Paper text:
[name] is usually repressed in an inactive resting state, where two [name] spirals interact via coiled-coil M-domains. Antibacterial peptides and partner proteins trigger [name] activation by binding to its N-terminal domain (NTD).
[name]-WT formed three distinct species in presence of ATP that corresponded to complexes consisting of 10, 12 and 14 subunits. No other oligomeric intermediate was observed in mass photometry or cryo-EM SPA, suggesting that octameric or smaller species are unstable. The differences in subunit numbers of the [name] resting states suggest that assembly or disassembly of the complexes happens by addition or removal of dimeric building blocks. The three oligomeric states aligned to each other almost perfectly (CC of 0.89) on the “front side” of the double staircase while they differ in the “back side”, which is open as a cradle in the 10-mer and closed with a seam in the 14-mer. Furthermore, the overall resolution range increased from the 10-mer to the 12- and 14-mer resting state, suggesting increased dynamics of the 10-mer assembly. Similarly, NTDs of “back side” subunits of the 10- and 12-mer resting states are not sandwiched between MDs but partially visible on the inner site of the complexes.
Numbering used by the authors:
A (entry chain K): 1 to 142, 159 to 247, 255 to 279, 281, 299 to 594, 601 to 667, 681 to 808
B (entry chain L): 410 to 478
C (entry chain J): 138 to 142, 159 to 247, 255 to 273
D (entry chain J): 479 to 546
The structure:
């Protein structure tokens, strides 16, 4: 209700303020332009207020010109400063306070004086005029009682317009008014999980009533909602509400779960709000309500709709915080909130993030630049000295103290004015850097990962994986090339990011490769959901990872809280055949449905299945090996299951030269953990060869290497550490002389 | 059909301007506003009557395209 | 040396913290350098501007508000949070009790600080 | 003062926590006689977590006892 409340006189003032920026060569419309535009319209009520206060027009211009400056500007893009919209926001509040229904020129002056931060506020402040003095100047110069008492009305709240408008839910309003206009099943039921928005749906329907948007069929109908917090003694009160509604003919009920006769005859047009879990348990089982309800699919809005909602609601937050918000930050905040936070859905997680970012930047910017603190301390100490001198009957020093205090106060006022002029001159825009800092503190993701543009991360994936998984270039290149095709858009959007089958000897590094891929993609090492197929052997176990059937009492619950995770399966060849039917659905459709009816998404998860089959054949070119291993893979698996796999990964055996690099990587990783003590650890080539043959076993792979390192290097290092900081800040060298392990202690 | 919305907005803004002028102790400008509001109400009534007469004159029949949609 | 030298209703059941902090009789709140900033950050938001201290009893929750009032005397709070008295409601005081909060909440809104 | 709240003898509180872990093998053998490998393995495994070689988030250690 912006243009609907402004009168003809206010539009002239706004036009004058807009045209003043062109003459003043200002690219932004500040609070000073509104004051100048108001003095050029001596026809409204505000003219008489300033006339009685001995305030002319020429004095205001010369007073406001000194505070402001002059500079270059651009052509067009004449927007409003964040401080300027606060006056417009306060004018409506002032109009509502005085029991008025219009926004004229008499409210612009009142709103300009309540800012206390812009250029216009100081002009009134310097003329011994405050809010209290100007408040009285304009004032002196100027039915169904049971239902309305046992429930909460909605049209009354929407009539005043004190809440944010419902923007972006236009699709559901049309469906609701379409269902309400039907003859049979004219009682829509809002179906959706708690967290996507269901109570606010009726608020949007009620808002359109005031705007005269509903047709004549839905014209002049009050919206009433019956809360569940007010409920044998309560049954005597509901018998009269239904009778009152029937006699009125215009009351619309809104419930969230006796009333079977009321709904069978079409007497009450109630709107349900029950979730899908209870809809199939308290409504579908009853035939009386099955023929009178129409479910409506209500879910969270898409990413594009959230950007529009935030753009529509941008003006509201730019006034309470007085921080300019650019378009680049709005589109980034929604993406960041949808990427990391996955517990409250949309769009409630996109407004609080930008609100916190704006509050943080306003708090950081609105501080003292080490200028007023010293002056305030000097004023305080001078006042204390004067107070001490007064009680000491020392009037000789008090004369000098009073003059010093007056000079300090004058300097403090000048410094505050010159400090606030600079702050008013500049603009505090919001960028993605501020939002990244706020979002980093909620999950713990390092700032170096959030600021990534998701452009160089995929290109350097081959180098990142080799840091933790050395060797096996064929396995790394295949997955790096297969994961980027789905992200670019070459693959079907509904299918998951990728599906792979790990084959080869046990203990070769499949789990380490999965952990490295998860850390390099999602930025977290613990963002992996490990599902062990060893426990899924009987038919009764298939109801565990998909959901417990009703009447009796995993994967779906875990994947919902972490939509960005790598699913890892162990021993996929040992599982119940019914599990493959569930698994194929994930790869084909992309989403599952549990017993509660809630649908989980799998478009942001990498499915990795590890099988031990074919290990006995390798131990007895990469393309030839893949072709030979493919024939034996379908012998015990479904012929059509392997067609849905993006690629087959075959690992190779670990040679003698590859084992030295594993020990080197382990030593380097151990060194990083001792960064707090500044310990340098270096291992010679002889020691790496000596320790490699101790745990050399093709059956276990690199597993025996950890035990040898922990029993050889760590055991001797721990004793030296616990000798009273013997090697604190020094260099430790490990060299094998041939018989035992020689540890030489040096300096750093 | 994008006919009565503008007339309703004009009537609303004229009523709001008259209400603002009443509290401003400016009765000279309110005389024209009252006549303008009366003329706008008469025009709105005529436009609504002629719009609903045309709707009553015609009939809407369902086709196979609507069922398919 | 001696010879040679307001909202009263709202404050009836609540104790003002800044009055106690002005004299400096209690120990200064030193150590909560990250909680006062978080509280003043949450209080400066358009939505969800009512922070709630969550923690087990024994880590310190009532004393957190003392530090917020302490910064008022030291001129550390910004202009938005300048000259605002903080009152703590006593839970041990409580139909009969419903008539007292209505008068307190009306005065709190009118005071604005 | 702190000894009077838990009953811990003063000889136990006043320790540098540097020689107690080093002499853990001798201390355990006083009350447990035999099976030197089990005592040595746990004595070497428990001192690595306190030194800092083990991740701070994980606990001090985990052991599985097997045998009669
Ligand atoms: N390419 C590699 N380079 C260095 N170390 C590796 C490599 N592959 C595996 N490792 C090491 O293997 C060790 C064992 O890892 P983990 O216990 O996850 O088993 P795995 O070898 O992946 O086998 P499995 O698939 O049978 O569980 C890890 O500590 C890791 O350091
Ligand atoms: N190596 C040992 N040195 C000294 N005493 C020992 C040793 N092993 C066992 N004991 C003593 O044996 C006694 C009998 O209990 P024991 O330790 O044999 O069984 P346990 O380990 O407690 O049995 P369970 O496995 O059934 O719980 C104990 O009081 C213990 O002092
Ligand atoms: N059209 C909309 N635009 C922006 N935010 C909305 C819209 N509709 C609902 N919301 C948000 O949803 C929240 C209320 O959700 P609620 O109705 O409680 O969900 P549920 O009914 O599932 O508990 C409000 O805080 C509001 O910000
Ligand atoms: N910043 C601080 N520095 C030192 N001590 C503090 C600080 N904040 C609180 N305390 C201690 O906490 C105690 C009060 O705890 P209290 O708030 O009553 O805990 P709870 O609210 O859980 O009962 C005081 O005795 C005080 O010594």
């Amino acid at each position: 209700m912006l243009f609907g409340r402004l009168t003809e006189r206010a539009q002239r003032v706004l036009a004058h303020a807009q045209e003043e920026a062109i003459r003043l060569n200002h690219s932004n419309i500040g609070t000073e332009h509104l004051l100048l535009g108001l003095m050029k319209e001596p026809e409204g009520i505000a003219a008489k207020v300033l006339e009685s206060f001995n305030i002319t027009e020429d004095k205001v211009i010369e007073e406001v010109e000194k505070l402001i400056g002059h500079g270059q500007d651009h052509v067009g893009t004449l927007h409003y400063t964040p401080r300027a919209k606060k006056v417009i926001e306060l004018s409506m509040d002032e109009a509502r306070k005085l029991h008025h229904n219009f926004v004229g020129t008499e409210h612009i002056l009142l709103g300009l004086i309540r800012e206390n931060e812009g250029v216009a506020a100081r002009v009134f402040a310097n003329l011994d005029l405050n809010i209290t003095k100007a408040r009285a100047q304009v004032v002196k110069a100027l039915n169904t009682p049971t239902l309305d008492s046992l429930a909460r009305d909605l049209t009354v709240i929407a009539k005043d317009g004190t809440l944010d408008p419902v923007i972006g839910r236009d699709k559901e309003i049309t469906r609701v008014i379409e269902v309400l206009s039907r003859r049979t099943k004219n009682n829509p039921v809002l179906i959706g999980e708690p967290g996507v928005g269901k109570t606010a749906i009726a608020e949007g329907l009620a808002q359109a009533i005031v705007n005269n948007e509903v047709p004549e069929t839905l014209k002049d109908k009050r919206v009433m909602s019956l809360d569940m917090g007010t409920v044998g003694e309560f049954e005597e009160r509901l018998k009269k509400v239904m009778e009152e509604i029937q006699q009125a003919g215009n009351v619309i009920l809104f419930i969230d779960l006796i009333l079977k006769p009321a709904l069978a005859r079409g007497e009450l047009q109630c709107i349900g709000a029950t979730t899908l879990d209870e809809y199939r348990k308290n409504i579908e089982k009853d035939a009386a309500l099955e023929r009178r309800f129409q479910p409506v699919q209500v879910d969270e809005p898409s990413v594009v709709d959230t950007v529009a909602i935030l753009k529509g609601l941008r003006d509201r937050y730019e006034a309470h915080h007085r921080i300019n918000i650019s378009d680049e930050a709005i589109e980034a905040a929604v993406k960041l909130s949808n990427r990391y936070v996955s517990d409250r859905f949309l769009p409630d997680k996109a407004i609080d993030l930008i609100d916190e970012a704006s509050s943080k930047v306003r708090l950081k910017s609105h501080t003292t630049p080490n200028n007023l603190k010293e002056i305030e301390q000097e004023i305080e100490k001078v006042k204390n000295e004067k107070d001490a001198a007064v009680h000491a009957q020392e009037f000789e020093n008090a004369a000098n103290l009073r003059d010093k205090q007056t000079k300090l106060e004058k300097q403090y006022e000048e410094a505050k004015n010159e400090w606030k002029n600079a702050q008013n001159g500049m603009s505090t825009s919001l960028s993605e850097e501020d939002i990244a800092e706020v979002i980093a503190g909620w999950t713990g993701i390092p700032l170096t990962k959030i600021n990534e543009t998701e452009s160089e991360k995929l290109l350097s994936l081959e180098d990142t994986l080799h840091e933790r998984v050395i060797g096996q270039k064929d396995a790394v290149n295949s997955i790096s090339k297969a994961v980027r095709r789905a992200r670019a858009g070459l693959k079907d959007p509904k299918r998951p990011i990728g599906s792979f089958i790990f084959l080869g000897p046990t203990g070769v590094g499949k789990t380490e490769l999965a952990r490295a891929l998860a850390e390099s993609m999602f930025g977290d090492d613990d963002a992996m959901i490990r599902v062990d197929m060893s426990e899924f052997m009987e038919k009764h176990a298939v109801s565990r990872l998909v959901g417990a059937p009703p009447g009796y009492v995993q994967l779906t619950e875990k994947v919902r809280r972490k939509p960005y995770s790598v699913i890892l399966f162990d021993e996929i060849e040992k599982a119940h055949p019914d599990v493959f039917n569930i698994l194929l659905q994930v790869l084909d459709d992309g989403h599952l449905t549990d017993t509660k009816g809630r649908t989980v998404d799998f478009r942001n998860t990498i499915i990795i299945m590890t099988s031990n089959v074919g290990a006995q054949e390798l131990q007895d070119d990469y393309e030839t090996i893949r072709k030979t291993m493919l024939k034996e893979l379908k012998n015990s698996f479904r012929p059509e299951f392997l067609n849905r796999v993006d690629d087959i990964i075959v690992f190779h055996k670990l040679t003698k030269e590859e084992l030295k690099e594993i020990v080197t990587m382990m030593v380097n990783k151990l060194t990083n953990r001792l960064s707090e003590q500044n310990i340098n650890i270096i291992v010679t080539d002889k020691a790496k060869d000596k320790i490699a043959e101790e745990g050399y076993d093709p059956e276990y792979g690199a597993r025996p290497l950890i035990r040898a390192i922990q029993k050889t290097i760590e055991d001797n290092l721990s004793e030296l550490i616990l000798d009273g900081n013997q090697i604190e800040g020094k260099k430790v060298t490990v060299d094998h002389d041939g018989k035992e392990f020689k540890y030489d202690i040096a300096e750093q």
